[PDB]
Amino acid sequence: SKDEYFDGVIRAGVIATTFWGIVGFLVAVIIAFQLAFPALNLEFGNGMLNFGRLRPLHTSAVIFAFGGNALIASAFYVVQRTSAARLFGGTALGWFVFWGWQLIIVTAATSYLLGGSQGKEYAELNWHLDILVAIVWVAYLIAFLGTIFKRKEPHIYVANWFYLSFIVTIAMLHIVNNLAVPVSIFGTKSVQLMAGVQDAMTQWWYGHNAVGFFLTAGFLGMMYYFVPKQAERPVYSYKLSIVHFWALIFLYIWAGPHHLHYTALPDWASTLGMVMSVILWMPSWGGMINGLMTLSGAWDKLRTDPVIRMMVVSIGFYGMSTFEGPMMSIKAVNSLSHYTDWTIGHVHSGALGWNGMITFGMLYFLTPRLWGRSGLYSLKLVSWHFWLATIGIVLYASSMWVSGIMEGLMWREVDAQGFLVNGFADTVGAKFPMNVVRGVGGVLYLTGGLIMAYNLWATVAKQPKTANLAV
Amino acid sequence: TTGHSWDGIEELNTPLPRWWLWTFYATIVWGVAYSIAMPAATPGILGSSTRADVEKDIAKFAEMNKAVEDKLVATDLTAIAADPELVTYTRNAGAAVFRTWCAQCHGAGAGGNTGFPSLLDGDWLHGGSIETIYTNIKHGIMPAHLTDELLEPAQIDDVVQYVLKISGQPADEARATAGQQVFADNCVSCHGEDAKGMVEMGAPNLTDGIWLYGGDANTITTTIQLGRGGVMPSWSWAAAQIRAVASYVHSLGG
Amino acid sequence: VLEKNATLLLIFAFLVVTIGGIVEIAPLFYLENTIEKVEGMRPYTPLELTGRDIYIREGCYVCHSQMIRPMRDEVERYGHYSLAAESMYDHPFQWGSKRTGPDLARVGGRYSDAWHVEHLSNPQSVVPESVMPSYSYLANVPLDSTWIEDRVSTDALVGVPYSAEMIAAATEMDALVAYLQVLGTMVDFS
Ligand code: HEC
Ligand code: HEC
Ligand code: HEC
Ligand code: HEC
Ligand code: HEC
Ligand SMILES: [Cu+2]
């Protein structure tokens, strides 16, 4: 039997997705405030709040915990339905992935503030945690790929192409970037296998591809399932799906050196990164086109359905960032952009605008269904959430652009006499209003997250036994 | 539309958008062009281009502003402070250079703080002359009496009180007699008697007015106990600029 | 097609995804420029190595870059543009990604130890406008150096030239200052 879809894990992951979203974004707001007012840092005593330590916590919680859980819930729901079979690992393998993932985030929460970090971005957790994550991910791929193997229909939905790719590539990236000799039990009590330029390359190959697969590909899978899930029928382009998918999947791995522009990294590598990052523009947009064009005719729905609003706007930000990224990947542009708040602007445009928004919409869609509910408790709240999230994202982006341009310019600016026009401190001071506005925008987005939490909770209350009949 | 449905979802067989195609192809073409043009070429750079552009940037900058610096170098530091052409451009830019390099220790104002000298004022530890200031800048930059058996716990207190009297007048009679005696013995050698101080040593004058230095009895006790040990890092490696800066610092007082 | 075939799709994906990594990462292992240390350079001294770990633990990297780009203005501000050879020993590499604070690569003497202590103790005190967090605990905690030998041994395994003699021979604030003082020094003296 077991004809019914295993909703179990998806339910757990969805709720946790909301929870981690709140935790991660709140850390985001707090650290932002710390940039605005350093007092928020403990003056005497490292303690609980210190920016250097908290920052990676924000990073990991937001990406792996929030984004990660979103990916788990979405992939488990989506693959099951798209292929029409009950999850291959079942409660056992899949639930293991749930608890295991939960353990991973919990360990991050304890470990990071404690000070144990490799110092490698998006890599920060210590080796023991790395082994745990590798194990959980291995289990996750078996469940997912197994689900595909067990499918009913002969064809495999493109959404699964993206999810599947994301799964495999992240595993490879994680293993490779994490090679390190353990000196001690924890924290970064390991030293990376590589050093210098090589370490930088491995790091950014890993680092970009992280957003590339974890944040883009996997999420593209989400978009592929959820955007078309609507009352309106067909409008899409399958051939684009094919071109866009392969081209993206191939091209994206080359993008690593754009991080490294005008650094110690050899010129040839930097160039390869730039060129491929520019080629990357097309496939990435292919995703957005495929998503948006699908809406055509359907647009009237946008006023009606806020979940749709979220998905659509999500693609808008996605395209924007996928455009801005290639531009910043040009050496001349990077010359200005690098080390400035602009990089952050770019990150949150994609993070809040693309990743968060699509996952949000995804959840609003799925959680009622998984919960054995016709719909969310209040649509109005989804709308309010939509607005809060949108203004917050835009405010964040605007502030960062102003700050970033100001910083790059101020840093580079030379006088008539040839001397440096501004002290670094002057640039720092210039940045303050930007820091505050950013703090506010992020705060608003966070509030939207709270509204989501309230709404979801209300809906969650309704029924025990929410097997949703056959499905 | 295509024949197979994936739970609700069906997909149209549609063509790639022409513009999308064009942009994709264009990017590819640009990439090939870039690679041929970059490392694998472009004209303008002999050999092969690289980060080598750095040399060009510096070189053109040098051509453009070499004259200003070169003119200044011939001139003496004192002259480079006076003259608003070099001399004034030396204060604003020297002042420009000052903010970037010096401000973090000596204050944006150049007024200084505890542990760092006030460059604006009249008082100079190493000497106010142009040569001295220049030397301070170019080549960069107090004995622990607590230990020297004789000084001890009490001797230090006494010397501190006495120095505060040289600087002004507090009231502690034991802390004065003893201190006078000790100062004449030891301190006076570097700080002189009546604390004129010796510029050669960088020993500051004890007969000073209220400055940023820890005038308090306790602070004086600590410096006497443990001694000083302050550094002015050399700008000869890091820094022409040193010269303009000397001209600026000199201009600062007057 | 290959739409239908799970194994084929998986294999092609793994293959497609691999090319960039093989093309970019692998050749670097081989290239000498990125491998060769500056001639003068030696590995971090045990105090400096410990301090570097502290710099890592604290999260200094999150605000401070250690990579000078080859532009005139940054050369002017920071010093000589960073060279691959400088980072040869760095497991893991410290190059920044963000400059909330200024670039640290070449503070090969720029400030006194005393300044560093005061500043780390309270950045606002020395630099009123600073965003930097206060790190007074550094003064509070002492180093046991139990682990230092293990750390150097591991680094040697990784290729760092520590002598047996170096291992045998080997406050947190002291270590951090020691680390900061070495940065970028290797190039200038050599
Ligand atoms: C922190 C590391 C400093 C740097 C950066 C700069 N200065 Fe400095 N300077 C510093 C100290 C602690 C002292 C006092 C040293 C002592 O005798 O205890 C000084 C001294 C000077 C002087 C001499 C002043 C005098 O009384 O003769 C000069 C002229 C001076 N400093 C200039 C100067 C310039 C131009 C700088 C930027 C290039 C600069 N200093 C940086 C501490 C520090
Ligand atoms: C020989 C060298 C001496 C000796 C024998 C004494 N002093 Fe000190 N002193 C000396 C120098 C070069 C400096 C400057 C230190 C620095 O700038 O880092 C000082 C400084 C002081 C100060 C501090 C002045 C200030 O607050 O800025 C004091 C209070 C002082 N010296 C006192 C002092 C006393 C009481 C001595 C006899 C016990 C004494 N000095 C001896 C150089 C030298
Ligand atoms: C984020 C906020 C940080 C944190 C995590 C660190 N620093 Fe910094 N730092 C920051 C700013 C905005 C500034 C400029 C204002 C100031 O000088 O206080 C700095 C400065 C430094 C400097 C001086 C650099 C220079 O002027 O050449 C150093 C040496 C420095 N910071 C060191 C340092 C260390 C060791 C850190 C981890 C404990 C650290 N910083 C963290 C902002 C931030
Ligand atoms: C991926 C999802 C994601 C979400 C959602 C997110 N962030 Fe971040 N955040 C990141 C990443 C990635 C970085 C690291 C950027 C870098 O290393 O350049 C970061 C870094 C930051 C920083 C450090 C900035 C700096 O200059 O060092 C702040 C502040 C911040 N985020 C605030 C926020 C706020 C406020 C929110 C409010 C919702 C938020 N974040 C939500 C991903 C996210
Ligand atoms: C989350 C959504 C997201 C999307 C979508 C995205 N990136 Fe980014 N981008 C990031 C993050 C996170 C960083 C910061 C990495 C770091 O910490 O240095 C970044 C930084 C960058 C930088 C600046 C690196 C530096 O330090 O100067 C470039 C260039 C870049 N990305 C290119 C791209 C390209 C090319 C694409 C797609 C074609 C893209 N981005 C899409 C998240 C994203
Ligand atoms: Cu990237």
**Experiment type:** cryo-EM
Q: Which of B235, B230, B228, B231 is nearest to B249 (CA)?
A: B235
**What is the total residue count of chain A?**
471
Written as one string, the DSSP assignment of C25-55 is HHHHHH-HHHHPPPSS--PPPHHHHHHHHHH
Neighbours of A40 (CB within 10 A): 17
Q: Which of A443, A428, A441, A340 is nearest to A397 (CA)?
A: A441
Q: Which ligand is nearest to the CA of B227?
A: 2
**What is the total residue count of chain C?**
190
Q: Which of A194, B89, A363 is nearest to C35 (CA)?
A: A194
SS (H, E, C) chain A: CCCCCCCHHHHHHHHHHHHHHHHHHHHHHHHHHHHHCHHHCCCCCCCCCCHHHHHHHHHHHHHHHHHHHHHHHHHHHHHHHHHCCCCCCHHHHHHHHHHHHHHHHHHHHHHHHHCCCCCCCCCCCCHHHHHHHHHHHHHHHHHHHHHHHCCCCCCCCHHHHHHHHHHHHHHHHHHHHCCEEECCCCCCCEEECCCHHHHHHHHHHHHHHHHHHHHHHHHHHHHHHHCCCCCCCCCCCHHHHHHHHHHHHHHHHHHHHHCCCCCCCCHHHHHHHHHHHHHCHHHHHHHHHHHHHHHCCHHHHHHHCHHHHHHHHHHHHHHHHHHHHHHHCCHHHHHHHCECHHHHHHHHHHHHHHHHHHHHHHHHHHHHHHCCCCCCCCHHHHHHHHHHHHHHHHHHHHHHHHHHHHHHHHHHCECCCCCECCCHHHHHHHHHHHHHHHHHHHHHHHHHHHHHHHHHHHHHHCCCCCCCCCC
DSSP 8-state symbol, B88: I
DSSP 8-state symbol, B87: I
| Separation of alpha carbons A295 and A290, rounded Å | 9
Which of A50, A191, A254 should we substitute to test contact with C (largest number of C Cβ atoms within 10 Å)? A191
Q: Which of A85, A158, A245 is nearest to C3 (CA)?
A: A158
- Alpha carbon of A28 to ligand 4 centroid (Å): 6
CB C179 within 8 A of CB C55: yes
CB B10 within 8 A of CB A233: yes
Alpha carbon distances (Å) from A148 to A152, A213, C75: 9, 19, 55
Report helix angle C6-30 to A267-279, nearest 10. Answer: 150
CB A149 within 8 A of CB C6: yes
C44 half-sphere exposure, CB direction, 13 A CA radius: 30
CB A169 within 8 A of CB A209: yes
Give the resolution in Å: 6.1
Q: What is the CA radius of gyration of chain C?
A: 20
| Separation of alpha carbons A130 and A359, rounded Å | 25
Report helix angle A379-412 to A424-461, nearest 10. Answer: 170
Is position C80 annotated in a ligand binding site?
no
Instruction: For chain B, give the longest Cα–Cα distance.
Output: 108
- At C16, list the tokens: 């497609």
| Separation of alpha carbons B134 and B249, rounded Å | 9
Q: For residue A26, count CB atoms less than 10 angstroms from its CB and return exposed for 0-12, middle for 13-18, buried for 19 or more.
A: middle
Find the closest chain B residue to C74 by CA distance: B54
Q: Which of A223, A317, A237 is nearest to B21 (CA)?
A: A237
DSSP 8-state symbol, C62: G
CB A406 within 8 A of CB A462: no
Residue whose structure tokens are 């750079």: B45
- At A207, list the tokens: 């680092």
Chains linked to C by 3 or more Cβ pairs within 8 Å: A, B
| Separation of alpha carbons A172 and A279, rounded Å | 23
Residue having the nearest C-alpha atom to atom 9 of ligand 3: C101
CB B125 within 8 A of CB B195: no
Strands A190-192 vs A180-182: parallel, antiparallel or unpaired: antiparallel
Mutation test of ligand 2: which of B113, B123, B142 has the most ligand atoms closer than 8 Å to its C-beta? B142
User: What are the residues whose beta carbon lies below 5 Å from ligand 6 (ion)?
Assistant: A 208
Q: Compute the 3-state secondary structure of chain C and give helix, strand, coil in percent, each to the nearest 5.
A: 55, 0, 45
- At A131, list the tokens: 């082994």
Report helix angle A51-60 to A8-36, nearest 10. Answer: 150
Question: Residues 161-190, chain C: which have Cβ within 8 Å of A?
Answer: none
**Chain A interface includes C82 (CB < 8 A):** yes
Find the closest chain C residue to B103 by CA distance: C127
- At A168, list the tokens: 């495999």
Amino acid at the residue C93: F
| Separation of alpha carbons A405 and A411, rounded Å | 10
Report CA torsion sign: A358, A362, A363, A364.
Answer: positive
| Separation of alpha carbons A375 and A11, rounded Å | 15
- At A450, list the tokens: 């709270």
Which residues from B are below 8 Å from C75, CB to CB?
Answer: 54, 58
Mutation test of ligand 5: which of A162, A258, A279 has the most ligand atoms closer than 8 Å to its C-beta? A258
**Chain C interface includes B31 (CB < 8 A):** no
- At A405, list the tokens: 């341009």
DSSP 8-state symbol, C16: H
Task: Give the 3-state secondary structure of residue B137.
Answer: helix
CB A266 within 8 A of CB C34: yes
Element (H, E) at B166: helix B152-167
Which of B2, B21, B22, B27 should we substitute to test contact with A (largest number of A Cβ atoms within 10 Å)? B27
Neighbours of A285 (CB within 10 A): 24
Q: What are phi and psi of A34, to 5 degrees?
A: -65, -40
| Separation of alpha carbons B146 and B155, rounded Å | 8
Alpha carbon distances (Å) from A40 to A47, A50, B213, C54: 11, 8, 31, 22
b/e map B168-181, b = 16+ CB within 10 Å: eeeebeebbebbbe
Amino acid at the residue C55: Y
Q: For residue A13, count CB atoms less than 10 angstroms from its CB and return exposed for 0-12, middle for 13-18, buried for 19 or more.
A: buried
Which residues from C are below 8 Å from A407, CB to CB?
Answer: 99
Mutation test of ligand 5: which of A166, A328, A337 has the most ligand atoms closer than 8 Å to its C-beta? A328
Report CA torsion sign: A443, A449, A453, A454.
Answer: positive
Task: Give the 3-state secondary structure of residue C8.
Answer: helix
Is position A338 annotated in a ligand binding site?
yes
Asked if residue B197 has its Cβ within 6 Å of ligand 1, the reply is no
| Separation of alpha carbons B176 and B168, rounded Å | 12
Task: Give the 3-state secondary structure of residue B164.
Answer: helix
Q: Which of A9, A24, A137, A25 is nearest to A444 (CA)?
A: A25
| Separation of alpha carbons A422 and A408, rounded Å | 11
Q: What are phi and psi of A371, to 5 degrees?
A: -75, 0
Cα torsion through B141, B147, B150, B155, rounded to 10:
80
**Chain C interface includes A53 (CB < 8 A):** yes
| Separation of alpha carbons B231 and B141, rounded Å | 5
Q: What are phi and psi of B46, to 5 degrees?
A: -80, 140
Report CA torsion sign: B246, B249, B251, B254.
Answer: negative
In angstroms, the separation between the Cα of residue C178 and the nearest Cα of chain B is 16
Is position A55 annotated in a ligand binding site?
yes
B15 half-sphere exposure, CB direction, 13 A CA radius: 4
Residue whose structure tokens are 């600026």: B248
| Separation of alpha carbons C156 and A183, rounded Å | 12
Asked if residue B198 has its Cβ within 6 Å of ligand 1, the reply is no
DSSP 8-state symbol, B85: I
| Separation of alpha carbons B20 and B17, rounded Å | 5
Is position B102 annotated in a ligand binding site?
yes
**Chain C interface includes B229 (CB < 8 A):** yes
Counted across chains B and C, CB pairs separated by less than 8 A come out at: 39
Atom index in ligand 1 nearest the CA of residue B123 equals: 26
| Separation of alpha carbons B202 and B198, rounded Å | 6
Q: Which of A69, A43, A93 is nearest to A359 (CA)?
A: A69
CB A33 within 8 A of CB A55: no
Asked if residue B204 has its Cβ within 6 Å of ligand 2, the reply is yes
Note whether B54 contacts C115, CB cutoff 8 Å: no
CA C65 to chain centre: 9
**What is the total residue count of chain B?**
254
| Separation of alpha carbons A64 and A218, rounded Å | 12
Q: What are phi and psi of A214, to 5 degrees?
A: -70, -55
| Separation of alpha carbons C20 and C14, rounded Å | 11
**Chain A interface includes C146 (CB < 8 A):** no
Residue C187 CB partners (closer than 8 Å, separation 6+): C38, C40, C41, C80, C83, C85, C86, C106, C108
| Separation of alpha carbons C123 and C118, rounded Å | 7
- At C8, list the tokens: 């084929």
CB A356 within 8 A of CB A389: yes
| Separation of alpha carbons B224 and B216, rounded Å | 12
Q: What are phi and psi of A216, to 5 degrees?
A: -95, -55
CA angle B200, B206, B208 (to 5 degrees): 110
